[PDB]
Swiss-Prot record, chain A:
Gene Ontology BP term (one): cytoplasmic translation
Region described as Disordered: spans on this chain: 1-24
Lineage, highest ranks first: Bacteria, Pseudomonadati, Pseudomonadota, Gammaproteobacteria, Enterobacterales
Subunit structure: Part of the 30S ribosomal subunit.
Function, in words: Binds directly to 16S ribosomal RNA.
UniProt keyword Ribosomal protein present: yes
Source species of the chain: Escherichia coli (strain K12)
Family according to the record: Belongs to the bacterial ribosomal protein bS20 family.
One Gene Ontology cellular component: small ribosomal subunit
Keywords: Ribonucleoprotein, Ribosomal protein, RNA-binding, rRNA-binding
Matches recorded under PANTHER family: 30S RIBOSOMAL PROTEIN S20 (PTHR33398), SMALL RIBOSOMAL SUBUNIT PROTEIN BS20C (PTHR33398:SF1)
MF terms (GO), sorted A to Z: ornithine decarboxylase inhibitor activity; small ribosomal subunit rRNA binding; structural constituent of ribosome
Gene it is expressed from: rpsT
The protein, known as: Small ribosomal subunit protein bS20
Curated annotation (Swiss-Prot), chain C:
Protein name: Small ribosomal subunit protein bS16
A GO CC annotation given for this chain: cytoplasm
Organism per entry: Escherichia coli (strain K12)
Family matches, as PROSITE patterns: RIBOSOMAL_S16
Gene3D superfamilies (UniProt xref): 3.30.1320.10
Annotated function: In addition to being a ribosomal protein, S16 also has a cation-dependent endonuclease activity. In-frame fusions with the ribosome maturation factor rimM suppress mutations in the latter (probably due to increased rimM expression) and are found in translationally active 70S ribosomes.
InterPro entries in UniProt: Ribosomal_bS16, Ribosomal_bS16_CS, Ribosomal_bS16_dom_sf
Domain of life: Bacteria
RNA sequence: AAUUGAAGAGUUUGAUCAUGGCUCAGAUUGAACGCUGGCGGCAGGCCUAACACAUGCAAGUCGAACGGUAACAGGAAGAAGCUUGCUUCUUUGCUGACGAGUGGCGGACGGGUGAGUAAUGUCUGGGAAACUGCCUGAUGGAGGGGGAUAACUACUGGAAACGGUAGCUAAUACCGCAUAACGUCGCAAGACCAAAGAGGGGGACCUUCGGGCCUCUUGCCAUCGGAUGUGCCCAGAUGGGAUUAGCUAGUAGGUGGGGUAACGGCUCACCUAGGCGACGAUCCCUAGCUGGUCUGAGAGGAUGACCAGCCACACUGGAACUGAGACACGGUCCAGACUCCUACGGGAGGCAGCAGUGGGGAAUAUUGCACAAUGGGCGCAAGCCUGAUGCAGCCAUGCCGCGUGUAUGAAGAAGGCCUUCGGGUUGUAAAGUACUUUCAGCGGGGAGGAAGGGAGUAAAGUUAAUACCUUUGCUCAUUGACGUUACCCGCAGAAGAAGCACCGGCUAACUCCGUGCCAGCAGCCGCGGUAAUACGGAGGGUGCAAGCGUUAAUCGGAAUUACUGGGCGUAAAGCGCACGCAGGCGGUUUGUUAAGUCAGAUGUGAAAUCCCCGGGCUCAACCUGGGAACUGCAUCUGAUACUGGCAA
């Protein structure tokens, strides 16, 4: 409707696309981690955890994951590897 | 100190939890008669030491399940 | 933002402003944290016209509160005594 | 909002001189007082208990020229004030500005005093008050303005002020044509024949 | 100083006393209707169709973030009529600025409505497992690069709405890289995580002579605090129905995984078989809740329009996206009903914002003026926006104030009505006479709501700088929608200004005439069938008064649900009689506890409202200062007579 709501519509669409991509990459890295924990692999899962840590902290800082969630992930996953190793 | 309550165990049979009846003794607003009045509470206990018919003190904590925001401190008076 | 601001309470064509401390996104005559003085722009030429609790104002500006232009003008009017 | 009719008729239903035509002459002499308030006025009423209470309230209102919602508000204010509600009610009726202008001899009647008050001929404390029911505080000076000073009325009215009893709670002085309401009138300082317990009981039913 | 507070009557009977119902007298209202209507002040105004909506406004702003120039006005340069001295035209964002666009912030506030919700809500009191844009304090960082994409241009699809394709460009847009804590994870060892510039001014130096460089202001990032706001939990309280007694399988709990900002069946797998319920679950009807309002002596009863706090909703049903915050009134998506446009392929809309329409209804307002004030958004500010708000319009809808004159005046005029025809009454009423001008009308004068903001100085601070900026004084023009304002003065003349109900008893106030169980009246008792104080008219009176009556609704009276504060032999009312569980109550003495109870303290019980003492509007209504109050709850400290617990 005829306003500056049109601009918020198009910006929220653009940011929807950007956030969906970054959120999807973050979730795939976390799937790498506890999909490596599905098999009994310690150092493979540690390599995947070191691969996911900067991106989850980074998406926490960029403002789309709200860092406590960031913390939870790494906390949960650390538990999984010292349940395993 | 902490605010706590005292009550008696009304039933027992649940997996690391208990339920405690509290007896508050309140004056009727219109009639001016002091009337007994209960408050049943789902109360948590780790390792379920208290059985049925006990008397137990009880404090409030964070939620531990649906209702269940209460946890014991001291089991007294278990006498059967 | 919390704001020390005026809030219109008198009758029609006869305002009496009460200076309050509100969360700034409330209504004008709505919800406030505390009222802290008043300002009558008439009152008569008698004694006051305005009293205003400077200790609580200094407390809230210590907390981070902002002050509108009228309340700043009134503090610049009642400076310490006059 | 005020009466505007035959006055001596109101004074004749009550059976008592309500001072409604004080004016030039002496005691009525052309009223046929007591005799006939209407066509069947020669009949004795055999009045009820509601009739005596009502008729007492009407006596007081028809004296002071007050209508019912205003009188009723005076009863509420006299009730809430500390003390004796009959005496408080007469103290509220006696502090009226048109009454104080009548008591000082500035008007011949209370309606003439009410027209002096109404036609901006009266100041209190050096400010002109246009209002019949202004409530004169103690230690006030109420006077006539320079306009409507030395008009005939007030002079004649002061001429008939000496025929009356010179109220104790005033400073009547007619030289300068200014007066001082000094204190509230005591119940024993006014009129002696109105029964205010009847109007307390009238409003308390 | 803050509770000075309580009325009855009519009607059962031939009469009585009692019981008992019905009814009246009071106060109130978002009121409507009937008759009447002068002025002002302050308030209030769709209670019904959460029905459908024409039209106009209700949310924008910033160039001191960025590419840029669509206009407007200048500047520079060129050419021309050339009056060689002024105009016309053109290239240049060069400048003040600015359409469109990117970007930041706001559109989650403000404003509306009460549909749903009987307890995921509200009120009161506790709590822990939290997030928090803007605002504030502290500690520090703010280095070095890259790829894009709008706008723009060129085609192109479409009736339109709206797109598509190919190139170009910027940033405080976006992304890496470095850096790394008193940050995250980890027991540690360690691992890992961010950023953005812009503006004002300037001595010297270096200029690829655009600017580097210095300084100030402002912005960015990280962490820890604070304040505010929000999310979550518990206990108590907050309608009616037992002619609704069983309800519940993610249901109740546990373990582990996931999820959220955060605890949690929030979710899933497995294990246990619980959980709720006669202290009323479940079902059904109704309903937004509160501060409060009305009534009441009070306790209560009814209610929750305005004003303020909380919740919920935004055509209907659902969903998420962006964001600090929404599952979003003037956002997105889908579906549905309706309405509209169409080239028939498809599109568009959402007044329960403010005015306004149509409809519904007994009923409820202007398609107004202004951002001057107060507040909000944006902005360094100027300022722009603001149907919030300030005001104005209409309406006796309420409350309050004032007016319609005042004094005199007996020939007790005339006329009306009654009359025992003597007179009485209307009635000092009118007329006459003498005064006054409130308000309305006319003409002048004229506060206050105006504080700020702008432009020059002077001083101080900062600094390399006597710049720039900030602060404080001083000076100069100014800033009012209301508004021919409030108010003051002058003019002319009583001149423009009184109705409505009632008159048998209750209930204040009476006769005549007309009608004759009719016409009709009525709240109850009841009037009217020929001399009606009850019907209709007249005279007279009574009550209220710019109002007055009727109707609807609430409380009172009603001690007719009785807690205060009732009853049960015969008026209604003792189970047909017992036994007895849960429940209620419990002789007497001592000791202990101190739960009830009592006393004090602290925190809270929002503000307004009620009450008290004051203050301002000429008074009043109204506004307002301080107190009291909010009868409560929680915690701590005591007392121990009574009640309870425990022991004897």
């Amino acid at each position: 409707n005829i306003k500056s709501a049109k601009k918020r519509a198009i910006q929220s669409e653009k940011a929807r696309k950007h956030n969906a991509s970054r959120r999807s990459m973050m979730r795939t890295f976390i799937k790498k981690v506890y999909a490596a924990i599905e098999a009994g692999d310690k150092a493979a899962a540690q390599k995947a955890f070191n691969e996911m840590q900067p991106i989850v902290d980074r998406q926490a800082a960029k403002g789309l994951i709200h860092k406590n969630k960031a913390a939870r992930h790494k906390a949960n996953l650390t538990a999984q590897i010292n349940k395993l190793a | 100190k902490i605010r706590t309550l005292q009550g008696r165990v009304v039933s027992d049979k649940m997996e690391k939890s208990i339920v405690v009846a509290i007896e508050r003794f309140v004056k009727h607003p219109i009639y001016g008669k002091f009337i007994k009045r209960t408050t049943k509470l789902h109360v948590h206990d780790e390792n379920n030491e208290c059985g049925i018919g006990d008397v137990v003190e009880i404090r409030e904590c964070r939620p531990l399940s649906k209702t269940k925001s209460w946890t014991l401190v001291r089991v007294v008076e278990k006498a059967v | 933002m919390v704001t020390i601001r005026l809030a219109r309470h008198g009758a029609k064509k006869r305002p009496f402003y009460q200076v309050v401390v509100a969360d700034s996104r409330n209504a004008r005559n709505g919800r406030f944290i505390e009222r802290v003085g008043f300002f009558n722009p008439i009152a008569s030429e008698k004694e006051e016209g305005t009293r205003l609790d400077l200790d609580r104002i200094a407390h809230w500006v210590g907390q981070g509160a902002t002050i509108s232009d009228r309340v700043a003008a009134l503090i610049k009017e009642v400076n310490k005594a006059a | 909002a005020r009466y505007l009719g035959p006055k001596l008729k109101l004074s004749r239903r009550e059976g008592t001189d309500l001072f409604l035509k004080s004016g030039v002459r002496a005691i009525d002499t052309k009223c046929k007082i007591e005799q006939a308030p209407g066509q069947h006025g020669a009949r004795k009423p055999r009045l009820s208990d509601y009739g005596v209470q009502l008729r007492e309230k009407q006596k007081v209102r028809r004296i002071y020229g007050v209508l019912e919602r205003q009188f009723r508000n005076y009863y509420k204010e006299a009730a809430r004030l500390k003390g004796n509600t009959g005496e408080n009610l007469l103290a509220l009726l006696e502090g009226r500005l048109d009454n104080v202008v009548y008591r000082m001899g500035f008007g011949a009647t209370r309606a003439e005093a009410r027209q002096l008050v109404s036609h901006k001929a009266i100041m209190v404390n050096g400010r002109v008050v246009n209002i019949a029911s202004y409530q004169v505080s103690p230690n006030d000076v109420v006077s006539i303005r320079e306009k409507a000073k030395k008009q005939s009325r007030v002079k004649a009215a002061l001429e008939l002020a000496e025929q009356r009893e010179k109220p104790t709670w005033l400073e009547v002085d007619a030289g300068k044509m200014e007066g001082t309401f000094k204190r509230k009138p005591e119940r024993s300082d006014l009129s002696a024949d109105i029964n205010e317990h009847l109007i307390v009981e009238l409003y308390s039913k």
